[PDB]
Design a protein around this ligand. Structure first.
Ligand SMILES: O=C1CC[C@H](N2C(=O)c3ccccc3C2=O)C(=O)N1
Ligand SMILES: [Zn+2]
Length: 108
């Protein structure tokens, strides 16, 4: 009865991802980054996520991951900012960078 296998939106409970889907980009699933407004994020990389809504068209500006363009990923239920979807790159072509403290971990 594993208690730590699925990630939900911390604000509303929307199903978002799974521990099984964690992706070591450059050899770690966890990347600590800051944006141009100086906000620091603990980003967890996932191969796959669901329950999101991707807004706008991709941008390469200020991308933390070489060769990838990003789109903002909201919770599709509550509209909370959960992270970004990355695309346009290589091996893999796409992935999700989700903000760890915006997710709640728990049983399947
Ligand atoms: O890889 C990424 C994802 C998007 C992220 N991003 C933000 O967090 C942001 C906030 C305000 C202005 C501009 C940005 C921007 O590029 C960022 O800086 N890099
Ligand atoms: Zn939500």
């Amino acid at each position: 009865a594993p208690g730590a296998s699925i990630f939900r939106c911390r604000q509303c409970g929307q199903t978002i991802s799974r521990r099984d889907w964690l992706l070591p980009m450059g050899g770690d699933h966890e990347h600590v980054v800051f944006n141009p407004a100086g906000m620091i994020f603990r980003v967890w990389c996932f191969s796959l996520a669901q329950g999101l809504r991707l807004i706008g068209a991709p941008s390469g500006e200020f991308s933390w991951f070489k060769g990838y363009d990003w789109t903002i990923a909201l919770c599709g239920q509550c509209g909370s900012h959960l992270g970004w979807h990355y695309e346009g790159g290589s091996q893999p072509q796409t992935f999700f960078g989700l903000i760890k403290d915006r997710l709640a971990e728990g049983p399947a």
